[PDB]
Design a protein around this ligand. Sequence first.
Ligand SMILES: *[C@@H]1O[C@H](CO)[C@@H](O[C@@H]2O[C@H](CO)[C@@H](O)[C@H](O)[C@H]2NC(C)=O)[C@H](O)[C@H]1NC(C)=O
Ligand SMILES: *[C@@H]1O[C@H](CO)[C@@H](O[C@@H]2O[C@H](CO)[C@@H](O)[C@H](O)[C@H]2NC(C)=O)[C@H](O)[C@H]1NC(C)=O
Ligand SMILES: *[C@@H]1O[C@H](CO)[C@@H](O[C@@H]2O[C@H](CO)[C@@H](O)[C@H](O)[C@H]2NC(C)=O)[C@H](O)[C@H]1NC(C)=O
Ligand SMILES: *[C@@H]1O[C@H](CO)[C@@H](O)[C@H](O)[C@H]1NC(C)=O
Ligand SMILES: *[C@@H]1O[C@H](CO)[C@@H](O)[C@H](O)[C@H]1NC(C)=O
Ligand SMILES: *[C@@H]1O[C@H](CO)[C@@H](O)[C@H](O)[C@H]1NC(C)=O
Ligand SMILES: *[C@@H]1O[C@H](CO)[C@@H](O)[C@H](O)[C@H]1NC(C)=O
Ligand SMILES: *[C@@H]1O[C@H](CO)[C@@H](O)[C@H](O)[C@H]1NC(C)=O
Ligand SMILES: *[C@@H]1O[C@H](CO)[C@@H](O)[C@H](O)[C@H]1NC(C)=O
Ligand SMILES: [Ca+2]
Ligand SMILES: [Ca+2]
Ligand SMILES: [Ca+2]
Ligand SMILES: [Cl-]
Ligand SMILES: [Cl-]
Ligand SMILES: [Cl-]
Ligand SMILES: [Cl-]
Ligand SMILES: [Cl-]
Ligand SMILES: [Cl-]
Ligand SMILES: [K+]
Ligand SMILES: [K+]
Ligand code: NA
Ligand code: NA
Ligand code: NA
Lengths: 527, 527, 527
Amino acid sequence: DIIIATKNGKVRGMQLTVFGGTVTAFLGIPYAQPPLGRLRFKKPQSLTKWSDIWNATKYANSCCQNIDQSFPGFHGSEMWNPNTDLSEDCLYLNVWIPAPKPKNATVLIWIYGGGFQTGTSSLHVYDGKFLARVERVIVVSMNYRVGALGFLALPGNPEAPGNMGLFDQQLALQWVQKNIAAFGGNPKSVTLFGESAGAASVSLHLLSPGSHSLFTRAILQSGSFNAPWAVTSLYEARNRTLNLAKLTGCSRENETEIIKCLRNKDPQEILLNEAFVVPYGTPLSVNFGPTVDGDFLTDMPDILLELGQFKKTQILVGVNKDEGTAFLVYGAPGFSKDNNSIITRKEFQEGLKIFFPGVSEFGKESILFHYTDWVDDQRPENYREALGDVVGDYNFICPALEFTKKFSEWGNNAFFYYFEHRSSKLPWPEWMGVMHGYEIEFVFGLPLERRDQYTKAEEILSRSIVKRWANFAKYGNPQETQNQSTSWPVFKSTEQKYLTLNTESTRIMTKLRAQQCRFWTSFFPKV
Amino acid sequence: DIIIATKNGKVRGMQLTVFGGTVTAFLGIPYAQPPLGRLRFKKPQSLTKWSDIWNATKYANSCCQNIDQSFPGFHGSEMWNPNTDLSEDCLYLNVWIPAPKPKNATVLIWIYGGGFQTGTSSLHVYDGKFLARVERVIVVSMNYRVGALGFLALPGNPEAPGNMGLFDQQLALQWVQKNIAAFGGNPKSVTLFGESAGAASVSLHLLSPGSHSLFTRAILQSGSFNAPWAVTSLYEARNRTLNLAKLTGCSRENETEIIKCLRNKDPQEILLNEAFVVPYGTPLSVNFGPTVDGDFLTDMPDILLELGQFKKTQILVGVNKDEGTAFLVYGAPGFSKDNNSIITRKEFQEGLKIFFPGVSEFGKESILFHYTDWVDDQRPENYREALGDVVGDYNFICPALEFTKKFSEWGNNAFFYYFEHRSSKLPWPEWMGVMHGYEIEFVFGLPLERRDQYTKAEEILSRSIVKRWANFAKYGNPQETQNQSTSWPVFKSTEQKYLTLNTESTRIMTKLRAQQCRFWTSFFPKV
Amino acid sequence: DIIIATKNGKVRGMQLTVFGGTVTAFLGIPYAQPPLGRLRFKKPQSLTKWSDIWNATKYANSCCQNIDQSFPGFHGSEMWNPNTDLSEDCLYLNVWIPAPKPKNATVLIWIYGGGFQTGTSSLHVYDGKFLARVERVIVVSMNYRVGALGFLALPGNPEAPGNMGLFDQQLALQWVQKNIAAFGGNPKSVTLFGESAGAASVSLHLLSPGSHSLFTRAILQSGSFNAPWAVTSLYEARNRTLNLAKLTGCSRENETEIIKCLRNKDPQEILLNEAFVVPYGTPLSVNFGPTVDGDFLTDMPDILLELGQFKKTQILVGVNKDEGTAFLVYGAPGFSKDNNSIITRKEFQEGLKIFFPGVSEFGKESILFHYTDWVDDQRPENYREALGDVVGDYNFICPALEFTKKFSEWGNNAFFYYFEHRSSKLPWPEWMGVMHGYEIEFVFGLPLERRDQYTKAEEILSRSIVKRWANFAKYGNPQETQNQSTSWPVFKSTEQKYLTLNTESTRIMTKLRAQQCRFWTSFFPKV
Ligand SMILES: *[C@@H]1O[C@H](CO)[C@@H](O[C@@H]2O[C@H](CO)[C@@H](O)[C@H](O)[C@H]2NC(C)=O)[C@H](O)[C@H]1NC(C)=O
Ligand SMILES: *[C@@H]1O[C@H](CO)[C@@H](O[C@@H]2O[C@H](CO)[C@@H](O)[C@H](O)[C@H]2NC(C)=O)[C@H](O)[C@H]1NC(C)=O
Ligand SMILES: *[C@@H]1O[C@H](CO)[C@@H](O[C@@H]2O[C@H](CO)[C@@H](O)[C@H](O)[C@H]2NC(C)=O)[C@H](O)[C@H]1NC(C)=O
Ligand SMILES: *[C@@H]1O[C@H](CO)[C@@H](O)[C@H](O)[C@H]1NC(C)=O
Ligand SMILES: *[C@@H]1O[C@H](CO)[C@@H](O)[C@H](O)[C@H]1NC(C)=O
Ligand SMILES: *[C@@H]1O[C@H](CO)[C@@H](O)[C@H](O)[C@H]1NC(C)=O
Ligand SMILES: *[C@@H]1O[C@H](CO)[C@@H](O)[C@H](O)[C@H]1NC(C)=O
Ligand SMILES: *[C@@H]1O[C@H](CO)[C@@H](O)[C@H](O)[C@H]1NC(C)=O
Ligand SMILES: *[C@@H]1O[C@H](CO)[C@@H](O)[C@H](O)[C@H]1NC(C)=O
Ligand SMILES: [Ca+2]
Ligand SMILES: [Ca+2]
Ligand SMILES: [Ca+2]
Ligand SMILES: [Cl-]
Ligand SMILES: [Cl-]
Ligand SMILES: [Cl-]
Ligand SMILES: [Cl-]
Ligand SMILES: [Cl-]
Ligand SMILES: [Cl-]
Ligand SMILES: [K+]
Ligand SMILES: [K+]
Ligand code: NA
Ligand code: NA
Ligand code: NA
């Protein structure tokens, strides 16, 4: 029976057996007033406090969200769907601590991705028990609001100010500051890590004055706020809020009246209308996401990045070799997870329409030109691979690299990785390669479980990643020092060294995607 | 009558005459609850407090320990045996202060060696009266628990958490922080110094967060925690604790029950069984020593060293020219302190078995290969000298040099010495050369006593060492500035300058044991 | 009527007219209990406090001291004799402030010289009214005890611990810290300046931990503690105290009894015996001066200087072109202030005996050799000039330069001057050149007074010195920025730039007395 006294009252955890040892799991601790009724669309409000013992022995409700129904029965898509009841009552967090209770352990705080429209902390591939067991760190993860319920913005209006889910994340960091010592944690040694939209969140906490003292350092897996899906302009955000009102029958003259009406809608009516607030979407559409609110974010984030206005600390940043491929089967013509998807030039052309719907003809021809100068054989997979690379380079890899250059130009140490191992168990087909999201199970140490059908080479690779992430969190330096590992150099503009993560041999390389990123970073923005 | 008010009450010292002046000695001040009964195997508990005057006019009990009985009646071994009653009631410390009472004197705190299985602060060669007299520093030394009573580990279990004797040392540093100003000491100018296991302790205080604010700088004489005898793995430590239980009839199912039973054993039964907790020992075996406990030591120390996680301050590190020779007469075949020990190739081979019992045949042939390429004469002492060098280089000199490179790579000033003077009075034979432990009497200034049969050259050498150690403690720079001495350069990786200490001429040299340490440091660990 | 409330009570000043403006002078403010009766030979004790108004309208008693009677009626010697009653009741200080009262003025604190055997703050050439008038700084000066009454040492015995007059100076700095804001001063911007023994005092405050927070920066005019007259060894100090006891009939067995007896002697009996505590003196003898007391001075000062243990701040240091000449007429044979003093080789030889009484024959021949290799003419003044240079280089110039190299090697800015202007009014004869002590009237701005028979060129030179000293005190940089002056470079070891101060043209030169100082600094000490 393990009971911890928190600031707001007692909580009871549960003991788990993990690799011949024990971890204590406190699952579903609340960290804010449930955001219901008059609190829908508002900043999270602080927790009242309880007497008696709160039982943190099961995962809580996931936040309301639309679900992926493109591949019913298929584990490759379905593993990302929520595995707890959906509810507006979802502001809870999880804590995994080593047993015996540690004395002053580093804390790793996970922020899930999902486009800021989806996601939940309770997914199997984010289970923190393995990290707590093996590295003796404490792992924390939180649910935060997503979609319109988390990001609806009528900027400047506190009834719906925008960025509510980012404030949810913030309030959970504050909970760790006030409470984690009771669990044997060091509030002075907190590292945020997150993937995709979770990585873009981590990058925005580096920018938010109110987050600066709530953590020590940051890890960004395939995401950063300068990615083109990551931040909505004030103009598109007001437009979206108003389109949502049109569709739900809540157009009014007074803006506060609009929100009042929106608070009477059932969550379903709101979720059903989210896809249509926009005239054309792509598979990467973020209809309701971070905005410049004058509160969480004081100015356009590209300006803060460029002018050095962010927390000074070390970062670890990385991407997967085939980021863009998972998205091609959610609308590009000629793609299928169930065949080899050899597409024509005409199909490639139509795919650019799917992925770059607002872009001029010239803009799209410039993409085709940069990506279809073949080298040179008449390989049939040319157009299929080019489309995946287009989508991965624009959306993930070039923004990650550019975030990393700009951040390290102000004097701090940065480490960059390129993940290139395809899981032996991936249910998606082979042409999709080393997909977006499929490093996460390596970072959380799932292949450390022998029962679990990963190869030996994969266990060893995961074990080494876990040690490098942990050494980064504790010490600021992602080395694996005992096993003659390749030493991981800092990423500097100029040399731009990065480390490859793979099962065969780990390499130091330079200037990842140099020709492609010159295209996306210096030319495409002008288009 | 000299009485000092401490935090826990009054203590009375005694006045000594030393070189026509006076020193006040407070011998046997307690600094913790005696660790008896239910306190055996636990962290030291803080002192209650007394009324009336505590008389600190004699050395206290030394901690329980096995004694060296290899050479009964021989001063060379017997001078290292305890010279006060053994008792579990042994947590006391000594203070020597100049007379008249100084105003804000630097403090030197001595930590004795003995393998973490033996040792005591009351030995003649650790008498602090000469340093206090001549350099006007205050000298403090403490008894700390050794053997299973000090280092038994069932890691994570507070009944026997491990590292108890290191916590004893810590609690004595805390006593100096709270109390030394009353004696005319500056708690802000404390230097730790220690030899062998005492030097490895000093190096672990550089690593322990709880020790960081309890001292200013560090001196390491023939020892550092990366020496292969200095730290026990969790795995060997649990195994040893359980083997100890088997032998004492204390195997139980509940671990806390094991410890409860262990607390009913007479100390002798525990001491008698210590040698056998291990399947084969060597003369350097440390059966019960420092472990990674999650408390004193938060992670494997080689990781902390490599990643720069330790107190930033100057260090003084050194070794003796023939470290390994003293050990050859505690089991290598063909050695004797009573003859010249000319050994054959076959004897050298068997000696490697004595010193490298768990090592593969290949591992041992690789030692023979590196050390027996003769230059080149057919000198009969070849194999005898090679064995001493093998044992000194692996166990002391290469680990000291590697500690020193890694520590100074993070920006702090380091000074390295090579002691090469054989005492005119050494009772051990000539082939043993400049032995392990025989600088200590020079550091404590014993040859400053003319009555004492050291040569003039030795008095002068000791006087100069004492001044360099004192200048290091007070000022961070071990120079002797008045007598046209050789200026002592800082040790940097790259140049690796060190200073030789000898009676003839003091030299600046580079890259001590460069070829040997490449062997022990980069190859041998792989074996 | 100008009345200032101090910590110890009200004081009344007087108004002076100075160059068509007003200065307020508070002369004779007490700063310690008078050191009489049982307080003779002890550290100064803090002031009780008074009611009613203390009248600070006249200079106080000067401390007991022997007087210079070598040239009765001669202004050149007599201007340095005390011009107020002598009394053991002499711990007072003076304050000159601009009118109107300034708001946060820099403070300059003057410490007079006189061999630590003589001197007083009330001399005409130390009048601070001109500096306060013209630079709007506040000037403070104090009387401090001299001779045995100020420096008698039985080291470690608080009845006569040594350095009492240095503690007098310290207690006056503390008075300025606690009280100067009431006078419109900035306790955060205090510069010490002093000449000869006063300059050596300033250099020892840079070394004393208890003085570190009592001032900001330092100016050293012809003096520093590494000069060979500036510090007495423990051995000579005990010997002197005991010789004093022999002569006064106070030899006892108990040392505290010796001091008790010494406290019954009339001050005259003590002063009369001071010259004889030593077997042979020279004209630069300092019979009772600073010692290493373990209190003011924690270790030998040459060690602290060399190892960088002193306050980190800017210094201004300088010397006069003919330091040594004033001393030749107090005992060297063949010298007279009343003729041209052309001396023979034999007279030069005897003069070395006067100035280097304890030195071997070899030591003295080595001086003759270094200084009498003529260039080359058979000029009759050769030996006369050589003796002056011997005495100035050994006693003042080489020690000042060496202090300045060592101090600036630890990173702080240093400025060095060479004063080479002979006052138009000097009453001493022409062969004595630019004498020791005759910059002081330039620093205090006496030639700014037109009524006063200095030339125009001298007024301008003084005005420029005053501005450079003031800019140094206020800003750390002794520039005169408005009148196209020669920019004063920092003194670095390596280049060793210094500035010449003269009436014609001000020059930047390098490596003052390079060949002579190599002799005194690297060879002579071995002799
Ligand atoms: C792989 O499967 C895809 C997905 O269906 C096939 O794409 C279809 O091809 C037809 C022609 O029969 C188009 O008119 C359809 O509209 C496509 N369907 C969709 C739903 O996009 C593709 O042709 C197959 N490719 C292979 C076998 O190489
Ligand atoms: C020096 O003394 C040693 C120590 O005894 C001798 O070693 C023994 O040599 C014998 C042969 O007589 C071996 O079988 C023994 O087992 C050795 N004894 C032990 C106890 O180790 C050595 O031979 C002598 N060496 C000399 C005189 O050069
Ligand atoms: C200048 O005056 C000095 C000082 O008196 C003269 O020195 C004396 O010379 C005589 C020879 O008549 C020595 O025996 C004396 O002992 C010296 N007297 C003292 C008191 O030192 C010196 O000769 C004169 N030099 C000149 C005129 O060039
Ligand atoms: C944990 O470590 C920090 C520094 O990182 C320290 O200030 C803090 O007080 C520690 N707390 C413990 C050991 O409880
Ligand atoms: C280091 O290597 C060993 C195998 O030689 C393995 O058991 C262990 O998991 C490795 N540790 C890390 C952190 O990679
Ligand atoms: C001793 O020295 C320190 C600085 O090293 C100072 O802060 C402290 O207060 C001093 N104490 C004394 C002189 O009592
Ligand atoms: C310096 O040298 C002298 C002998 O010339 C000697 O008496 C003294 O002990 C030496 N001091 C040190 C610190 O070595
Ligand atoms: C004088 O200047 C200092 C800084 O040099 C400042 O901190 C202080 O308060 C000032 N006092 C005044 C203007 O009274
Ligand atoms: C600057 O020069 C003028 C004459 O041109 C003079 O009156 C003044 O005293 C000078 N100031 C200083 C500080 O030297
Ligand atoms: Ca999977
Ligand atoms: Ca010895
Ligand atoms: Ca004059
Ligand atoms: Cl085309
Ligand atoms: Cl390159
Ligand atoms: Cl062989
Ligand atoms: Cl070299
Ligand atoms: Cl001659
Ligand atoms: Cl030059
Ligand atoms: K090898
Ligand atoms: K010479
Ligand atoms: Na489903
Ligand atoms: Na014995
Ligand atoms: Na006179």
